[PDB]
Write a protein that binds this ligand. Structure first.
Ligand SMILES: Nc1ncnc2c1ncn2[C@@H]1O[C@H](COP(=O)(O)OP(=O)(O)OP(=O)(O)O)[C@@H](O)[C@H]1O
Ligand SMILES: Nc1ncnc2c1ncn2[C@@H]1O[C@H](COP(=O)(O)OP(=O)(O)OP(=O)(O)O)[C@@H](O)[C@H]1O
Ligand SMILES: Nc1ncnc2c1ncn2[C@@H]1O[C@H](COP(=O)(O)OP(=O)(O)OP(=O)(O)O)[C@@H](O)[C@H]1O
Ligand SMILES: Nc1ncnc2c1ncn2[C@@H]1O[C@H](COP(=O)(O)OP(=O)(O)O)[C@@H](O)[C@H]1O
Ligand SMILES: Nc1ncnc2c1ncn2[C@@H]1O[C@H](COP(=O)(O)OP(=O)(O)O)[C@@H](O)[C@H]1O
Ligand SMILES: [Mg+2]
Ligand SMILES: [Mg+2]
Ligand SMILES: [Mg+2]
Lengths: 340, 477, 124, 340, 317, 170
């Protein structure tokens, strides 16, 4: 509860802004935001909010809000699935957010029990699988011979105190490819989005992460995987591997940059600007905290005197040998940008 | 209008079994939700229709004792849900789960009565406008803030918060607030319900003389069957509504436990011919806490700054009762029993007390940052308190030993005893709408001021008192 | 019921350790007031694991007191970490075991509940 | 099991002795001891025992003992409730002890299951609330305009190993105002009655505790509340707040007096004698253990040479400025009463 | 424990006691039921010749359906009764598991057309353990010094089986499996073994005080053994380190092996009706005598043996 | 799982080798190895293995292997019990290994549930006791006046992670 599952989905959808009027029609995205359970005012917080960034202009939103008898809260996901399928069957593509399949979980068992269909585990009608399998299995990649279209679907799920393996979550994580875990347990610490590397994966592999991330992010996630140990060990380290400090230092500093959080998305070539600087240990050593000042200013700094660099991404489509030199010449300056 | 067909809307009771009375109409089958009238009675026995079983027979959920009922007793079909007298002509007065005057001062002379089952505000009725509303209560106000037309909800088991905080908020709120006020006590004690009345007399709020009453009292509690505890919260809601809608005002609404709307199902489901579920519950808890709670909301005609309370069965948040409800509260406060031991009161816990109005735009960048930092330090604090050091502090790592001074003092600063706890030790009912929250608390986390003899700053929040207490309990030579 | 025992031990460790945590700093106070004038230019010109590194290196009120005076803190530091480091790591166990209690508290409640109806609901 | 739930209720009832033949008719009390489950010989241990102190002379006792089919064990509480209601509707008052509502809990689910009323949680028939709410809700305070009578009801409950939050206990502690917890876990330690401050309260507030306790006891309970920490912390304290020892010292010494236990009640003005001396730190410092010698002797000492003091309670109704001086002059003597 | 302690009590009791004796074995083994017979022959108790038999043997066990294990305990009870009533004598009665009267319901309820309950059980367990147990009691015509035994399904006291029964036993002894590991036998635990006849008027002020003090020290002992010190004793606080000598030795003094365990190591079947319990045990808690090399006083109770063992296993030079 | 429950029972049976052709006829032993659940190839690993030491020459082995409908997996123990009873009623003696009563536990609840006999704890039909009591109670010592024979029976049980007190094991 209250971990960010919708801000993320509200930023992931908001990002499609520029493309829904840009050039490359294939580099676009239509969204189908579904809401299951939610108070109809939480939904009006979104419709309006999205409308503020004009997002609503290129999105379809649908609601199965509490009032709605359990069946509506049941038929809704299967409704938005058919919304995007127009696009996944017409060249076009879509981003569908199934808001609370678990809330549909709470809302499914109802319809059946009342039908007197023998209950199984925690009321869930036996076909709890066929409920969230049958669905997701529709957001599929389309081949050129069939369309080239698509439909990406991120099913939202309620974590009870931290357990991700509960019946329904197992049911849903035993299908979907890639599960971003959001931990309330972290959140307030500043550790937002708060994703538990180790109990989450992209699954589909490096395929998604363009040459950009495969050049930078390739280290990022797994750097943190085993790091779960040393991060939870350094707090009591002494006569050990002196220099080991490096592998831990690449965590704290990096942290202040990896903690995304605002009503605004950073274009992929911008992601290439700041985060990339980190993997290429340049900022590092400097006493953190002010790092956020970088990830905010660096951008203004970019559009103020570095509009070329990003374009190289729009030309070559990776970090250049030349551009690396340049960005290097910009982040290095920031070491002493607050250093006397 | 409430009028049947040109045929009998009279049904002869065919089966009584506890809180369920099946009835059978031959010339006028009465709809789901219709409030019915038991004849042959020595009082008021309304049985709310619930299902349409066939063989020309409904199935009602009895609103009061079913005692002495008889297989054959005539049941009267009114033609509409249990409809209570809604209006100004019911403020100050006390109403039971049907609109019967329970405070004893006689008839509730009213122009009309609203049905207790009404279509909730639609989607184009809603209003995004989330205007702030200060309660002047540390955690409950600063940490997890509130808001106009918002939704409060406290989470603790038996006696840790809830009723107390509802009276607390009543103090910091109910007394001073434009518009009206409502209090639908559901399930809970009749004692509190009486005192609350009298306290509402001693303090004017409820004036039996003039006509200067801003609150309304809808009650339906414990000594009653489930079919009444089920709808009472509805009436105290059918009440806040008419004040907002037809009388465009910014009401509030106190529900002493709103999930009592659920225990009612835990007591009437299976006995209605249903197949159980989570812990036994019902194939409905969802739509229930749903359909109803989707009523105490604002609109393009008025606002309802509602306030509710949700119990924690078996001390298990893992119960689909406090849980399913979470998704409705525009502010959280899961009070820990494990906290009560520590004295920390209110028992609002440093993790499970969220909000939907805590952004730097309304609550503050500085404040929300220290909040984040409070909980941040608090998290590794929850671990350190046990993990690594193993109970006993000291050890090493002053970084977290800092936490043992900061986070600890923080817990204290947030442990606001307030007025409502006056009956245990007559202690300084600390409060104050923000005002000097600046500097004081900010100091701690950064290290400014923090250092004074730990527990020397326990039963008080405002930092000023640290030195103002250092004299009370000193140490040196 | 079950985890209670596992939760008892921890709580039992708290009292002793968590309290001594305060003493961890206390020992320091009862030392510096007199140690200082003798240090720097005033002359010249569980239980953690600090009281160990020095002893393993074997492979008249002057030095014997000056050293001990500075070593006193070095030794007592064991308590500091023993009541800090050993508590910070251990306390996490409380929240874990507790949340786990509420897991098999709910479980049993929603386990045996199945059986009760497993027979009840299906008959004639 | 075996914690003292009935001794307490047997002493709370026994205390009404003096009043059931004294002067102030309003300062009386009739008791209705109900027994649910119990072997009919445990009940004959009480009827006779009470009879020994003549208590039975002003009490009504009723039994739903094991032999009795589950319904008897079910109708019984609702029977004794109607016993006292004579008094709660006739000026007079009553003390009703519902012995084992939990045993009625075990005995309720039966009657229904056999009636084939769909079971809910741990067999309990859905209306497990309306079972122990509907009842307690009858022991209410009566206003002069309605009678001035009363009916105080202490429902006895079986604690399984220490869990007070079990279904039924929640059910019963979510209604009643004030729950005295008795812990077997403590008992033998000497810590009897063994009441867990923190997981218990009077709830009704200072209203019950007369000016006497509001003058003394006002500190007592909450002194121990947070003290649960320092009492479970001092065992490992060192370089901390030197003088803090005071707040802990007020516990150990006080303990030997707070541990009531005998087949005899100490009148309120006697409670005012011994316990009061403690809150007003006079005994304190002395090495404990012999404290019990005080709480026993002090009394003989009182009736032997201090019959006035107590009377001041029967005159003013609080501890006097004068009497404080006197009691002070008596407890101070006891410091050196065993001190050479 | 249970069967063993029932034979133990049979020793310390059954053999010497005025009046008669009964043994209704319910559910349990047929083996024990046979040996018990023969042992009752070898020792006279059951004499096939003369007519000098004080006991009666009512059996109904395992190889049988539930409807028999249900009533067997009843017959062995219909037996103790007539000896007390119509023949005014102070019988005793050994029920090798009385809750076998309940497994019978766990096997016949639902198949009788009933709706299940606690773990499955029956809407009756209560009145059951009730109605029956409300028979093996005294009266103004005779007494029944009965003895029963109650199983602990899934090692869960939390089962409404050993539990519901508690309210019937005029003496408790919840033997710990977690204790068996420690050897401590009988496995009677220092908390869950109550009574309704432990007042200083019958058991003793001194004795009940040391008992309270035994368990007192034992409680903070249960905590210290883990909490604070964390497993490893020593540490600090000799106050509780005292507990590590006192409470520990106490556990030992109470770990009376007795005759019935003769088949595992032929050890000194310690017993003796109080007699020299005075001085000895009292010493420990106060500190008198306590100090001898911990486990040096393990498989023996009477303090006299501490020095009488110090020779067996010594230490010094 | 995989702890040695069958090697032990396969060595305890193998040991009877020397006696099943030695002198003292009373110092002998016939074995009745029962298998409940097991893949019919695990059973052929044993039949053959035992056959390698010639053990099979003085043993009877029986199978209720997975394919077999739950009832076979249920009637099997009660079948081998009657195998040895020839010996426990004819002077001779026997060693019967009931391989997996717990697997029969998993295989018992089936037959009843389908018969619609109200389930109890973890499905087990109420008479889960009378299921494994009624049986074992047959491997008894025989007195000379009745035969002097015998039947020793070691029921094999599946320990889930280490808990020995689970319903069925209790
Ligand atoms: N990027 C962010 N950084 C920090 N806090 C954020 C961010 N985005 C949102 N928040 C706030 O934190 C909370 C998380 O979003 P949201 O409320 O939708 O979470 P959720 O997990 O979907 O749960 P629910 O909607 O039921 O409350 C909200 O109060 C939200 O406005
Ligand atoms: N004031 C006392 N101080 C110490 N021990 C006491 C005191 N009063 C009673 N006891 C004894 O301690 C036990 C507690 O009383 P009682 O037996 O009625 O407890 P209970 O919790 O009601 O449980 P149950 O009656 O089922 O045994 C008894 O053996 C009792 O006689
Ligand atoms: N005497 C032994 N010493 C060491 N390992 C052994 C011994 N006997 C057998 N093993 C091997 O260890 C495992 C145990 O035997 P077995 O496989 O039959 O165990 P089990 O507990 O009966 O379980 P399962 O047959 O289902 O695997 C086998 O792989 C076996 O061959
Ligand atoms: N403001 C408070 N400060 C300290 N303790 C409190 C406060 N309110 C309640 N408590 C504690 O909680 C107990 C009962 O909880 P309470 O909040 O009154 O229950 P609820 O409100 O759910 O009816 C009290 O009797 C007392 O120990
Ligand atoms: N007096 C005793 N001393 C030591 N161990 C014992 C004693 N009695 C039983 N045991 C242990 O308990 C095991 C079986 O328990 P037992 O008491 O015989 O069961 P029950 O009596 O319930 O039939 C023994 O085989 C042995 O390890
Ligand atoms: Mg959300
Ligand atoms: Mg009692
Ligand atoms: Mg095997």
């Amino acid at each position: 509860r209250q971990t960010g599952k919708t801000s993320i989905a509200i930023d992931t959808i908001i990002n499609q802004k520029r493309f829904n009027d840009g050039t490359d029609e294939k580099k676009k995205l239509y969204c189908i935001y579904v809401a299951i359970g939610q108070k109809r005012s939480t939904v009006a917080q979104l419709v309006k909010r999205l409308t503020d960034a004009d997002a609503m202009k290129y999105t379809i939103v649908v609601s199965a809000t509490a009032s709605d008898a359990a069946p509506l809260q049941y038929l809704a996901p299967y409704s938005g699935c058919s919304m995007g399928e127009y696009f996944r069957d017409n060249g076009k593509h879509a981003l569908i957010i199934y808001d609370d399949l678990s809330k549909q979980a709470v809302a499914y068992r109802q319809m059946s029990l009342l039908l007197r269909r023998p209950p199984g585990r925690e009321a869930y009608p036996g076909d709890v699988f066929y409920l969230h399998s049958r669905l997701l299995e529709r957001a599929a990649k389309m081949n050129d011979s069939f369309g080239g279209g698509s439909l990406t679907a991120l099913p939202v799920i309620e974590t009870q105190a931290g357990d991700v393996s509960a019946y329904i979550p197992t049911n849903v994580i035993s299908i979907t490819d890639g599960q971003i875990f959001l931990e309330t347990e972290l959140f307030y610490k500043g550790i937002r989005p708060a994703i538990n590397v180790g109990l989450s994966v992209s699954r589909v592999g490096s395929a998604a992460q363009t040459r950009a991330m495969k050049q930078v992010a390739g280290t990022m996630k797994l750097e943190l995987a085993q790091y779960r140990e040393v991060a939870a060990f350094a707090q009591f380290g002494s006569d050990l591997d002196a220099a080991t400090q490096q592998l831990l230092s690449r965590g704290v500093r990096l942290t202040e940059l990896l903690k995304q959080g605002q009503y605004s998305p950073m274009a992929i070539e911008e992601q290439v600007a700041v985060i990339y600087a980190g993997v290429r240990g340049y900022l590092d050593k400097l006493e953190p905290s002010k790092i956020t000042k970088f990830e905010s200013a660096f951008l203004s700094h970019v559009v103020s005197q570095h509009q070329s660099l990003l374009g190289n991404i729009r030309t070559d489509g990776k970090i250049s040998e030349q551009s690396d030199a340049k960005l290097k010449e910009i982040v290095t300056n920031f070491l002493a940008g607050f250093e006397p | 209008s409430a009028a049947p067909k040109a045929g009998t809307a009279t049904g002869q009771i065919v089966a009584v079994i506890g809180a369920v009375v099946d009835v059978q109409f031959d010339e006028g089958l009465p709809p789901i939700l219709n409030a019915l009238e038991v004849q042959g009675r020595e009082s008021r026995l309304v049985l709310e229709v619930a299902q349409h079983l066939g063989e020309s027979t409904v199935r009602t959920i009895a609103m009061d004792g079913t005692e002495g009922l008889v297989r054959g007793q005539k049941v009267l079909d009114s033609g509409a849900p249990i409809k209570i007298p809604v209006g100004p002509e019911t403020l100050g007065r006390i109403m039971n789960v049907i609109g019967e005057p329970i405070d004893e001062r006689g008839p509730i002379k009213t122009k009309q009565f609203a049905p207790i089952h009404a279509e909730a505000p639609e989607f184009i009725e809603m209003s995004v406008e989330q205007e702030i509303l200060v309660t002047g209560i540390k955690v409950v106000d600063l940490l997890a803030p509130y808001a106009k037309g918002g939704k409060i909800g406290l989470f603790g088991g038996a006696g840790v918060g809830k009723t107390v905080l509802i009276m607390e908020l009543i103090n910091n709120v109910a007394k001073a607030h434009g518009g009206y006020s409502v209090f639908a006590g559901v399930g809970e004690r009749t004692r509190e319900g009486n005192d609350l009345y009298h306290e509402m007399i001693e303090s004017g709020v409820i004036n039996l003389k003039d006509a200067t009453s801003k609150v309304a009292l809808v009650y339906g509690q414990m000594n009653e069957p489930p079919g009444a505890r089920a709808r009472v919260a509805l009436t105290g809601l059918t009440v806040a509504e008419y004040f907002r809608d037809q009388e465009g005002q910014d009401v509030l609404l106190f529900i002493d436990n709103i999930f009592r709307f659920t225990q009612a199902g835990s007591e009437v489901s299976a006995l209605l011919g249903r197949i159980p579920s989570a812990v036994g519950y019902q194939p409905t808890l969802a739509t229930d806490m749903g359909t109803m709670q989707e009523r105490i909301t604002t609109t393009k005609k008025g606002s309802i700054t509602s306030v509710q309370a949700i119990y924690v069965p078996a001390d298990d948040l893992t119960d689909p009762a406090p849980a399913t409800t979470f998704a409705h509260l525009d502010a959280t406060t899961v009070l820990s029993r494990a906290i009560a031991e520590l004295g920390i009161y209110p028992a609002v816990d440093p993790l499970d007390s969220t909000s939907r109005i805590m952004d730097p735009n309304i609550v503050g960048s500085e404040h929300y940052d220290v909040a984040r930092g409070v909980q941040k330090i608090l998290q590794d604090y929850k671990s350190l308190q046990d993990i690594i050091a193993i109970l006993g502090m000291d050890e090493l790592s002053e970084e977290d030993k800092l936490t043992v001074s900061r986070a600890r003092k923080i817990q204290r600063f947030l442990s606001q005893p307030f007025q409502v706890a006056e009956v245990f030790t007559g202690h300084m009912g600390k409060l104050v709408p923000l005002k000097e929250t600046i500097k004081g608390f900010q100091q701690i986390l950064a290290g400014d001021y923090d250092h004074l003899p730990e527990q020397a700053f326990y039963m008080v929040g405002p930092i000023e008192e640290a030195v103002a207490k250092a004299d009370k309990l000193a140490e040196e030579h | 019921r079950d985890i209670t025992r596992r939760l008892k031990s921890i709580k039992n460790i708290q009292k002793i350790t968590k309290s001594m945590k305060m003493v961890a700093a206390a020992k320091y106070a009862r030392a510096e007031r007199e140690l200082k004038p003798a240090r720097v230019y005033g002359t010249g010109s569980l239980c953690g694991a600090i009281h160990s590194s020095v002893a393993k290196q074997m492979k008249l009120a002057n030095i014997i007191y000056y050293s001990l005076k500075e070593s006193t803190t070095s030794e007592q530091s064991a308590r500091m970490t023993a009541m800090d480091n050993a508590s910070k790591n251990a306390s996490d166990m409380i929240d874990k075991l507790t949340l786990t209690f509420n897991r098999t508290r709910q479980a049993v409640i929603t386990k045996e509940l199945i059986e009760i109806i497993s027979g009840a609901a299906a008959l004639d």
